[PDB]
Amino acid sequence: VCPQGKYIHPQNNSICCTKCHKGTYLYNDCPGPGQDTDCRECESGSFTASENHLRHCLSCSKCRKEMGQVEISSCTVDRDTVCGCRKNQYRHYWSENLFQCFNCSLCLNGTVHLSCQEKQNTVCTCHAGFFLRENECVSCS
Amino acid sequence: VCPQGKYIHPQNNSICCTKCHKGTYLYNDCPGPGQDTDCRECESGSFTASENHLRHCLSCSKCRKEMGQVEISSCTVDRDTVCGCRKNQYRHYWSENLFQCFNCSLCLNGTVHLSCQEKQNTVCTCHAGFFLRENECVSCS
Amino acid sequence: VCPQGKYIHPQNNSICCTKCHKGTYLYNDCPGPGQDTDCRECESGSFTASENHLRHCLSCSKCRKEMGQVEISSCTVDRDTVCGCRKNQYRHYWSENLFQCFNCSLCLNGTVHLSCQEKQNTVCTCHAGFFLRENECVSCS
Amino acid sequence: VCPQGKYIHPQNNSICCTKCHKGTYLYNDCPGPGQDTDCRECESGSFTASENHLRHCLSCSKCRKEMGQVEISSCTVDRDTVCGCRKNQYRHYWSENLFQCFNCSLCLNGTVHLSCQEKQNTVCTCHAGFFLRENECVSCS
Amino acid sequence: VCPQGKYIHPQNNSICCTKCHKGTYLYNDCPGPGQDTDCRECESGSFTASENHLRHCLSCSKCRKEMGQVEISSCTVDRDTVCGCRKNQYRHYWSENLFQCFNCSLCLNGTVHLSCQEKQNTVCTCHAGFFLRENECVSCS
Amino acid sequence: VCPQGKYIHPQNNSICCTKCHKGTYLYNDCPGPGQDTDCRECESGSFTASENHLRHCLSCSKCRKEMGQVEISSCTVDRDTVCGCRKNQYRHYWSENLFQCFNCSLCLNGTVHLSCQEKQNTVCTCHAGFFLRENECVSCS
Amino acid sequence: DKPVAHVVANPQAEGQLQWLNRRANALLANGVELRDNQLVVPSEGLYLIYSQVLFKGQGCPSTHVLLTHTISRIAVSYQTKVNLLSAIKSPCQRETPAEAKPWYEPIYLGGVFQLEKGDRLSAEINRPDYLDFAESGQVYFGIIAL
Amino acid sequence: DKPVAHVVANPQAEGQLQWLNRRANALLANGVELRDNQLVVPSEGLYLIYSQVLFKGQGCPSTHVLLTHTISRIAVSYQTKVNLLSAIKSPCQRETPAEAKPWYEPIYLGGVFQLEKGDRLSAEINRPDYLDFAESGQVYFGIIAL
Amino acid sequence: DKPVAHVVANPQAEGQLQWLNRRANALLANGVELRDNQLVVPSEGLYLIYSQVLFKGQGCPSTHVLLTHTISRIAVSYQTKVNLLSAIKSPCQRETPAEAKPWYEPIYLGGVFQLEKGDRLSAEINRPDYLDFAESGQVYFGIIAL
Amino acid sequence: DKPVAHVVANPQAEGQLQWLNRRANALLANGVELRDNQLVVPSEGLYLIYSQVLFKGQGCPSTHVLLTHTISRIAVSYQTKVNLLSAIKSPCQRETPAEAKPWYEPIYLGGVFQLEKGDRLSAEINRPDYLDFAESGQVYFGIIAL
Amino acid sequence: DKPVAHVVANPQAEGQLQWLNRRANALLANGVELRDNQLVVPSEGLYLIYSQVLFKGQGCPSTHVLLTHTISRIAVSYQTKVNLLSAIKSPCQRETPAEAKPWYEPIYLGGVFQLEKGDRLSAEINRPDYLDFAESGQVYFGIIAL
Amino acid sequence: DKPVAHVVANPQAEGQLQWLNRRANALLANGVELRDNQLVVPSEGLYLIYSQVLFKGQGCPSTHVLLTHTISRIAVSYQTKVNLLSAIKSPCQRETPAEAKPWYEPIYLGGVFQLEKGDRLSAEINRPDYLDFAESGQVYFGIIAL
Helix, strand or coil: CCCCCEEECCCCCCCEEECECCCEEEEECCCCCCCCCEEEECCCCEECCCCECCCCCEECCCCCCCCCCEEEECCCCCCCCEEECCCCEEEEECCCCCEEEEECCCCCCEEEEECCCCCCCCEEEECCCEEEECCEEEECC | CCCCCEEECCCCCCCEEECECCCEEEEECCCCCCCCCEEEECCCCEECCCCECCCCCEECCCCCCCCCCEEEECCCCCCCCEEECCCCEEEEECCCCCEEEEECCCCCCEEEEECCCCCCCCEEEECCCEEEECCEEEECC | CCCCCEEECCCCCCCEEECECCCEEEEECCCCCCCCCEEEECCCCEECCCCECCCCCEECCCCCCCCCCEEEECCCCCCCCEEECCCCEEEEECCCCCEEEEECCCCCCEEEEECCCCCCCCEEEECCCEEEECCEEEECC | CCCCCEEECCCCCCCEEECECCCEEEEECCCCCCECCEEEECCCCEECCCCECCCCCEECCCCCCCCCCEEEECCCCCCCCEEECCCCEEEEECCCCCEEEEECCCCCCEEEEECCCCCCCCEEEECCCEEEECCEEEECC | CCCCCEEECCCCCCCEEECECCCEEEEECCCCCCECCEEEECCCCEECCCCECCCCCEECCCCCCCCCCEEEECCCCCCCCEEECCCCEEEEECCCCCEEEEECCCCCCEEEEECCCCCCCCEEEECCCEEEECCEEEECC | CCCCCEEECCCCCCCEEECECCCEEEEECCCCCCCCCEEEECCCCEECCCCECCCCCEECCCCCCCCCCEEEECCCCCCCCEEECCCCEEEEECCCCCEEEEECCCCCCEEEEECCCCCCCCEEEECCCEEEECCEEEECC | CCCEEEEEECCCCCCCCCEECCCCCCEEECCCEEECCEEECCCCEEEEEEEEEEEEEECCCCCCCCEEEEEEEECCCCCCEEEEEEEEECCCCCCCCCCCCEEEEEEEEEEEEEECCCCEEEEEECCHHHECCCCCCCCEEEEEEC | CCCEEEEEECCCCCCCCCEECCCCCCEEECCCEEECCEEECCCCEEEEEEEEEEEEEECCCCCCCCEEEEEEEECCCCCCEEEEEEEEECCCCCCCCCCCCEEEEEEEEEEEEEECCCCEEEEEECCHHHECCCCCCCCEEEEEEC | CCCEEEEEECCCCCCCCCEECCCCCCEEECCCEEECCEEECCCCEEEEEEEEEEEEEECCCCCCCCEEEEEEEECCCCCCEEEEEEEEECCCCCCCCCCCCEEEEEEEEEEEEEECCCCEEEEEECCHHHECCCCCCCCEEEEEEC | CCCEEEEEECCCCCCCCCEECCCCCCEEECCCEEECCEEECCCCEEEEEEEEEEEEEECCCCCCCCEEEEEEEECCCCCCEEEEEEEEECCCCCCCCCCCCEEEEEEEEEEEEEECCCCEEEEEECCHHHECCCCCCCCEEEEEEC | CCCEEEEEECCCCCCCCCEECCCCCCEEECCCEEECCEEECCCCEEEEEEEEEEEEEECCCCCCCCEEEEEEEECCCCCCEEEEEEEEECCCCCCCCCCCCEEEEEEEEEEEEEECCCCEEEEEECCHHHECCCCCCCCEEEEEEC | CCCEEEEEECCCCCCCCCEECCCCCCEEECCCEEECCEEECCCCEEEEEEEEEEEEEECCCCCCCCEEEEEEEECCCCCCEEEEEEEEECCCCCCCCCCCCEEEEEEEEEEEEEECCCCEEEEEECCHHHECCCCCCCCEEEEEEC
């Protein structure tokens, strides 16, 4: 049980070596105990977001154009691509990693109880003669 | 030999008790000498037409629809169902308890010697040129 | 194993006694070894057709009127009633003990190959232009 | 209350043993706890269609010749004899286990709304000038 | 070829042992010739509908709520879950094991030639001026 | 490296033999150097469109009825089934091997710049007051 | 010691149904009595009551004919006639046109009843003239204590 | 102490065959139970099983009519319906042309069977609408241990 | 310990009536033997003898058909065949003109007789070709000691 | 030596799903048999079972259409049909008003199962008339031992 | 000795996706473990990973519905969730106006991946309430070492 | 030593389908080569060929759209393109009126084929512009020797 930050060598399982940091992938194993590991920088379109000894870098994601997403941050070597929404829009999560950008619901015949957050639509409270339906104030009659 | 209207107790054959009247059946025996017997009224569809100490009431009869019978009297608790015939019909008894309703024979080319009774067909006497056959006047030639 | 013509006593099964002859039935058992058996003559309407030790005589049969049977012999004490057919009639056996009397088939456009027997109809052989059907000669065309 | 698949021994009611399967009947009981039961294969003309501990096999049925039935499957040791109808015929059930084979009603001056099923006659819908009667299209006049 | 009701042991293929009955699954093989097989009752949500030597019980089905099916019988240890339709409904089979419950078609301007069966819709015959279409009587004009 | 038209024997890789021609498939390998190969004619519904040593013939295609395709040429032993379109129709290729037959677009208020080819719709050029849209001339207003 | 009775119809009295005991294969043992053409049980208990009546006929009459066989009980507990068992038959459906083909119809009754001492059991028919007296074992009545 | 059952058909439920116990000349004694219109024996032994069904009809229908009476057994040893006794009758041979003359047909079943504890015996018919409810003793079922 | 026999007709031998024992719901217990298609009682006593025969037919033949069922006894006391029970039926009244509608006729015999040891009981019919072998419980014979 | 089977649908039998072996890119090797349009494995082991069915349609019918593809197993250990894999599709949501645009729907099943010797695997569908026979590799079935 | 796992969805827990092993046609053999509704491989090698999820729905909801099925890997080499396989479906295109016709959508994932010891594989969905628990073989997960 | 290939689509080349190897969870081992966007096997044997293609779309176009995925083989034994696997989908049934709701459609192909040395396998599609490059594991191709 080697300490944290080190992985066991796949062959000759008695020597452990430090894991490659973010932005690097393993190209060769440790050439003996105490030496540094062969960590190479990820190429274009590839990234590693955590400490790893993987043989290749993860493919960075692309922003979905049909969901209205925009590229807040580019595909770097150590950080994944960041996709979001433009001004006055909020993201609705269909799943853990899938979201769609929708325009913030403007209050009509009502007041804003809570402003449009990043992952939440505008909360609108209606007045007398109107009631909420699909986050929209509509007349009772 | 106890007097009329009394039956001997099935157990301890030295005490006799009065029989249940019509419309009632024995539910329990006599709780000692001189006491009244447990006679319970018959339920729907059951009857007793005479003095008895039977454990259950007789099943009242039903009028036969295929015989043309009609329900003159309903199934009561003390009287059996009365089945008969409608107007201008007489009953012909196949057996003691079985009868069929037939329309009264109307006289044709003859006279009524005796009217249609309850249990007898119309007696028809023919004239010259006709003779009786199956209670119908038919020509000799 | 007592010799033929003797039956074992129902009680005290060591003494056997002679069976009653035809026309008699057992009324009492043997009053000791070597004594005669109590055999009584059958009454009217009863008979025994063989050696027996039965407690009562068999009821003699009656000739069936709906089968056309006639009483050849009366119901005696030792012989069963004999039923048959009249002149020019033959018996057809539906079962072992049931038969119906039919008139003998007279030959029409044919000859008698065999005469009408007791238990057989008249055998008729036809000629040219006729053929047999239900023991009757009928034209082919 | 022993678990399913086992029956209580008729004698010494504290040991239960597995039932005999289909095609086998009980010949002897269990010779002690944990041993197998004596289940013997049914002979010719006999069968058992379910798990049982019966002392003898059920007699397999025979197809009725007067009903037009035909033997689809033979009398095996575990399956009852299967009786059905031939081509273009349907079975009409007089009772639960009694059926008669009738020829499928061909449409005359009508159309087949539903084809002749196994247990249903051909449903025929007539046209103008004809009406249905006993599953046959007949003229109104 | 061992007699019916028995399966060959997977190892040492010269001894055969009785199969497990309905409601039981094989847990262990036969501990020698003539001994009983280790058959254990199925747990909740599992069943075996026939004689078997399977290592685990079948998963009992669930009634489809989107098809309108209702649970006639619960998931027992030996019988599969029975799913059907409520009153005045019939099942239409899309496949062998898939069916949808539809309301029985009430006759409008027509008569019921055949009542709504379990697996068949109501057969309706129209009158003059109306004709059948999708099991509904509609005017010709 | 044997010359063109010959394949290496799968076993004893020092002798090569001529490939089977179109319409024939390999049934047996070469029985020695210099001998002819066992090439058998393809059965019905199978074909080979090129020189090959395949163990079985390719399954010839069928014309799609939902695409409006028609069978120009039948499934022979050496040529694949040819599917096309009828008169005044052109094929639109969804993929390399999938196409749908559409009626040629007739010019309305326009002229035919190019006639309806096999794999191209009719090219229609409009006049003043009309413009092209989905290969149809429609009014600007 | 079991009260048993198996009586056969008399073949010498045409037109009426009379039961006999002093014939072969007929029993009246252990208290059962034959009085007024009826069977009287000697004790209270469970009795199997059985009867079989065979009706014969030469052809089919013009009028419809119904044959009724009824085993009835007159007990000391009710003192009226009560039909323990009953059956009805219709031998002929249509009038004979031709040769009158004979017809035969058997009617069998059988049951188990709780009977008290002194009860009288009568097997009655509606058409005595159609009775079968040709051979023994065709028409008979019987009660056996159980 | 002998398990005995003699049940009669219900004359108030037209269209179905229902057995009753709390009627005169009907017994359910010594363990025999009446559940789901079926008789359940309390012990293993030899039972005499009997039944009688009377079918009535006003005229002859155009279609042929078959009357089936079946005494069936569902035992703990087989757990399926097994026909102990069965009989079939064909009351009508031809369609009635005229006056619809009534027809009556009795069917009787009787046998001795070895029955285990918990066995259920059912007397079933195919045409309940033809049943005779006019008088008692016409349609009945029964089992007596022996 | 009661001598009991309940035998069923063989459904595999068309044209003859053969009794079987090694079938479900069939008994041969306590001394009763099945020899030469006949039942032999092991002791002298009172026996309930019952039988039921079902006759089937496709249409009505031109000639009249009579069905006779007879339970007969050959005892050591008389050594001749004696008809204990007998019944006759006439299934067809007229010849079928058209579709041959099937006919079914059940005949049931039942009685109580005093039988000695060695007596042989035979249930015989006149038309074996009309026998019903379709389902169990339709044709059967039986004797139970009482 | 690995038991392998890759069968393709027959393009000449419209209205039914029949599997073939003697075609290009189709295999039946090392004991796997094709009997009664079903695949029989020669040994007990782990098999990858896969299938793909393509449904075609000219327009959307007025009634709703469901396409069911089921890989079922009839083994010597259970002797009943057991659905190893199943899938259901609903190609049409609304009736076509206009030009009937064609629709295509693929259904793929794939799994790993432990199968004994003699087990029969059947790939069945509910609507054979919708099957795709236009090109090879669209509808196929297969089992490979592992 | 090949690490194999073929797990089926639990049909008794509505609203969640739970994998089971102790069911017919389901395997967990040679080191593969089921912990926290996830599959743990016992060795480093090439594994075929497959899964099939069937979504059911009564009618089309007013809001658009997306069904996402993802097979994800949490390995000892990266220690974060990595989507090995993913698929998205849109069962409904328009809101149902009328009768709510049911819809069914199958999603299948399958691939070959190099996995180290201790890697955890999870098959996750976005709408557990739409899961199909009606019949076996519709929703399942599996990994087989190669 | 088993020839294995699991390639993923390139997320940087919009409008074309290009396969990559030097990415995480992607393999090209033991002789399999990637030439001209095609996979070349190094030996003759049984290969499991699998592929999955995800199509995305913003709304439904006015014209009908068909998505075809085909795994085709160009072998040294035939020297022509032969479709090993094929599938067709119709994502849109009607034109979008309103908000363009996105649609997603997965197509999976999988089979086992006998392949010779030098055979070239190509996974081709008809609409490259609809391809999904958003996340890894959505579009991929693969062959594993068995």
